[PDB]
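Hi team,

Filling in the usual template for the complex we talked about on Friday. All components are listed, including any nucleic acid strands or ligand strings, so the model treats them as one assembly.

SUBMITTER: L.P.
PURPOSE: interface mapping
COMPONENTS: two
RESIDUES: 513
SEQUENCES:
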Amino acid sequence: YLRPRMQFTGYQISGYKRYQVTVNLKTVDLPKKDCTSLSPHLSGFLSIRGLTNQHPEISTYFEAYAVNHKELGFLSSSWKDEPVLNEFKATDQTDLEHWINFPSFRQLFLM
Amino acid sequence: DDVDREFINCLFPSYLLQQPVAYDLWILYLQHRKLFHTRKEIWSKLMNLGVLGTIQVYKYFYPDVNDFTLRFGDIYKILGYFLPSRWQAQPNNSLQLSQDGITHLQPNVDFAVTWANKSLPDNKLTIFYYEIKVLSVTESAENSNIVIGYKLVESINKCQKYGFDLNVFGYCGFDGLITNSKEYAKPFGRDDVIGCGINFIDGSIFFTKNGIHLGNAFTDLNDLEFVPYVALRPGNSIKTNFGLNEDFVFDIIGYQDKWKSLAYEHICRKFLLGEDNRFIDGKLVRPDVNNINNLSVDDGSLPNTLNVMINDYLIHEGLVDVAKGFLKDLQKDAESKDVIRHNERQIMKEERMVKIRCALENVISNTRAMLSTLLEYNAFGSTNSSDPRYYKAINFDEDVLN
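RESULT (copied from the run log):
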């Protein structure tokens, strides 16, 4: 489901309003056992359009990095200090909260 | 003989044996020479006494030359060592050190700080160098909470809290930035050999990373005493090499050879001295001049004085025929006439004295003595106290006489 030409559709709850979100992938480049390169793992176009209101469509080009537990860990402290990777880092506490919200994260860490 | 040479190369670091500090190491070895007294037998004897064994085994490389041509074709406490050799154990029991004190060092958030066994004398050596290797990391892979360097010997709680103080000249691994700074280097992580060295010629502290010279961090640090120093947060450990056990990574020998060649390039590229003219009332008085010795090759005074000394030495040793041959050769080559007449008078006087029935060695001995006197009294370079001191790079007996 992460092929180059693959489309995803859904919503997004911002504030209290709902928007329709479409994602079109462009390039998928997922690494393996060794990875010390900062080339983006995923790339695509994300478009957000109004559903409750008459908000116009805003479409953007985005890039993405996966989490492999060798170099790019769950917390933004194992991520290296680079100018391209410094926009993915917030705080270890914020990362722990936003990851503990998901049940698969918990089922991963309790096995 | 060769056995003493093999033992002294197997006991002491190799780069230290090519400096003018090697005289003290030779004296130290010869004082305790009864303990020790084709290199496989010497290495086996040194391992039986114990220089090649711990617990990690101290291996040694021995080639096979006959097979190659066939198929194809604490003792350092006993001796009196005065240079750093181990880390010092803190009395508060905040560190874990091995039996030898170099193989492992792990803290037991505040930094755990420690220094080395002994301090570095300012007026005795030319270049000092030692390495560490990070064994484990407690963040990112290439980010370690280790500060390594040198410390001025005349705040410890400040060193434990922050990592360093105003008297620490060192390299920090958590940000890749020197203590009292600047874009100098990058942080080091696991399995990284970081070396620290001090140069007493120009007086600068440099650091190396995995065999690459990273440049001079601090400058103008002469006439001072330093001690190796390390600060570690709990979680990461280092292995220290002072050069006694294993071989370095850097190639510090090439650094020393380059500086010695520079010093040699800088230095080397009437006819009777008479009595000392500055003895009045039994004391030395300073003349108000720029130099006391005004001999040069370009004026011919230095070869004339050398020829006079050579003739006097040859006559004094009972080699009158060789002196006659030298005088004949000097006649064949031709203020040289005055030298010819003086030499001829000397052979005539010697022949008269022999019929009725030195200065060179003084020059050699005084050259060695004034080199050592320059070394031990901390003389300035040329005019200022910031110029390089080239006399620290000269081993007179190993580089000139032999």
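MY TAKE: Chain A touches chain B through six residues (CB under 8 Å). The CA atoms of residues 15 and 85 of chain A lie 28 Å apart.

Thanks, L.
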